[PDB]
Amino acid sequence: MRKAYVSVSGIKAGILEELQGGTYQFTYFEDYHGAPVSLTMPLKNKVYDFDVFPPFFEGLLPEGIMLEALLRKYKIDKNDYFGQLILVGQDVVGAVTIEEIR
């Protein structure tokens, strides 16, 4: 289905994967060795599973009025957190950037 590159300060760090049902999975690239994507995701583990949208990537989405500004600029559903993340992935608060693979 939908997958996306996850880069840290320009350097590709891993892949965030939308998984079957409603789960999500982030996998670190073996080559990557800089700083962690999130402090909740140390490099000592390369695979992280989630039953919902992971909270770090959800924390990069707009809020309040700026979320309504996004939903009226793009043709995207108000609950599609992964889809909204791809639309803003080029610039969010952290040093992390997301670009879709498809």
Binding site: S38, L39, T40, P55, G59, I65, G94, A95
Partner: protein, 267 residues
């Protein structure tokens, strides 16, 4: 544009626009992406938010809190707009790791209020480089927010920054007197302290919070409490000179006096 002599949810009614600082003109340019500043124009729901956030930010700098470059500009409708320099952008188009406490504790936008000040301490102990140093300003930041009526300090308003491989609490952001901005304000604190969001007392901040949860000694607490005592005169002087309206200024001073009296600042 250009600045002038300024060199449940509440925040979800004000815009947070990205902007670059023009090199020659010195004016701001709102952009969709790749901005180095955040601009907050007037809100059509709650009044005088930019002027509120501007003076509150300066009050935090007076008590010794780390505050980035902030100020006020003139919008195109000749209203005042608050600006702040992002600390996750540091020239040469480089970035710094910035994570808020909802991301660090497994919460989201819908549950950013379902936490507590005790969980905020747990995050700092787990990730910060010098947790003992961070507790000192968390005590100062929590006391400051209680004094200036900032009742919107949810999980997304606390952030950890990674600068020079040192992990500490980010500089101040989204600090304003949100009690005077609304009517029928429900809480004094956004996250409960000792299971309390209202009617917090001196023993809640100086004994349970400062001693039992943060581990600060008595001489450290006395020095910080004394710091807030000497800043009350300058705080009232800065507010009277701020860009708030006279009616908004009186609501700010009255609430500041009420919180100071609760902490026995005048006796």
């Amino acid at each position: 544009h250009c600045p002038i002599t300024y060199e449940m949810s509440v925040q979800g009614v004000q815009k947070k626009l990205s902007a670059k600082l023009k090199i020659k003109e010195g004016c701001f340019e709102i952009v969709d992406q790749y901005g180095q500043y955040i601009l907050k124009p007037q809100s059509d729901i709650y009044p005088e938010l930019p002027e509120n956030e501007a003076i509150t930010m300066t009050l935090a700098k007076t008590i010794g809190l780390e505050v980035p470059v902030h100020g006020l500009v003139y919008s195109k409708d000749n209203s005042l707009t608050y600006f702040i320099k992002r600390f996750d952008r540091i020239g040469h188009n480089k970035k710094l790791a910035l994570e808020d406490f909802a991301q660090l504790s497994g919460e989201d936008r819908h549950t950013k209020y379902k936490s507590s000040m005790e969980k905020v301490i747990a995050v700092i102990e787990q990730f910060c480089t010098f947790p003992k140093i961070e507790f000192v300003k968390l005590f100062k930041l929590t006391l400051f927010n209680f004094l200036v009526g900032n009742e919107d300090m949810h999980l997304k308003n606390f952030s950890l920054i990674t600068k020079d491989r040192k992990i500490s609490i980010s500089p101040a952001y989204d600090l304003l007197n949100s009690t005077i901005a609304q009517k029928n304000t429900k809480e004094e604190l956004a996250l409960p302290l000792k299971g309390k969001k209202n009617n917090l007392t001196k023993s809640d901040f100086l004994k349970y919070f400062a001693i039992e949860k943060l581990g600060l000694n008595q001489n450290v607490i006395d020095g910080i409490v004394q710091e807030f005592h000497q800043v009350i005169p300058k705080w009232q002087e800065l507010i009277g000179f701020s860009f708030l309206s006279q009616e908004m200024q009186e609501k700010y001073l009255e609430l500041l006096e009420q919180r100071c009296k609760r902490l026995n600042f005048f006796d």
